Specification:
10 helices, eight-stranded mixed beta sheet, Rossmann fold, binds magnesium ion, Probable ATP-dependent RNA helicase DDX41, alpha/beta
């Protein structure tokens, strides 16, 4: 409980909450498969950022998390890499069937953030496959794609979905996607999402979970409004600030 604070102070990591898992200074010690480690080098990513150092082990242990981190902090790997791992184990335990809804869900304010994060997921998923792991399937639920097209992407079952709140809500209400097996919900740029009026749509999306989920909220800012929303959204979260 003693050296971990030295790690944190050095990399300017502020944490709140109980039973915080130890920070980890290397991707290998976070027990990632080598195909992912190679993907990281191959993208020039040799060393974990502060948000990754404390964030990844927090997520891996199943804790809810509030991440106060900015665009460019490396936050995207914090919420993409662990769920890919989670999905990989589920698919190995029981291969996903044709319509089995998403296991992991990532909600973004905008179409372009959604595509970009979806793009990242498909990169790591592809490297796993090229190591003989099964294909994990990543779906986009954003505006500008038809209904037909949306149902096409998920006909094979979907492990991970990246959505904007409006389109996802509509699909849930129309029973075209289900959250019956969704165990992981990441909220990216939550501050922006609140500023844009998506609060209600997101609370509605919440009501489509039957039973526990791990929830993650990422926000560049933590004013009183985001703080109250986070308290209602998450369960005993570890708060991590860089
Ligand atoms: Mg961002």
């Amino acid at each position: 409980e003693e050296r971990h604070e030295r790690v944190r102070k050095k990399y300017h990591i502020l944490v709140e909450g109980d039973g915080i898992p130890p920070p980890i200074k290397s991707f290998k010690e976070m027990k990632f498969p080598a195909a992912i480690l190679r993907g990281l080098k191959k993208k020039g990513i040799h060393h974990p950022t502060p948000i990754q150092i404390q964030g990844i082990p927090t997520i891996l242990s199943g804790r809810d998390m509030i991440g106060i981190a900015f665009t460019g902090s490396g936050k995207t790997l914090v919420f993409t890499l662990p769920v890919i791992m989670f999905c990989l184990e589920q698919e190995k335990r029981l291969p996903f069937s044709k319509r089995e809804g998403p296991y992991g869900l990532i909600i973004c304010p905008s179409r372009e953030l959604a595509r970009q994060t979806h793009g990242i997921l498909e990169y790591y998923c592809r490297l796993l496959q090229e190591d003989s792991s099964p294909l994990l399937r990543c779906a986009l639920c954003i505006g500008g794609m038809s209904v037909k097209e949306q149902m096409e992407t998920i006909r094979h079952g979907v492990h991970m979905m990246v959505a904007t709140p409006g389109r996802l809500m509509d699909l849930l209400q129309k029973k075209m996607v289900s959250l019956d097996i969704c165990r992981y919900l990441a909220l990216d740029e939550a501050d922006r999402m609140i500023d844009m009026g998506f609060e209600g749509d997101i609370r509605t999306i919440f009501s489509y979970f039957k039973g526990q989920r791990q929830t993650l909220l990422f926000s560049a800012t933590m004013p009183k409004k985001i703080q109250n929303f986070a308290k209602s959204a998450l369960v005993k979260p570890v708060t991590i600030n860089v």
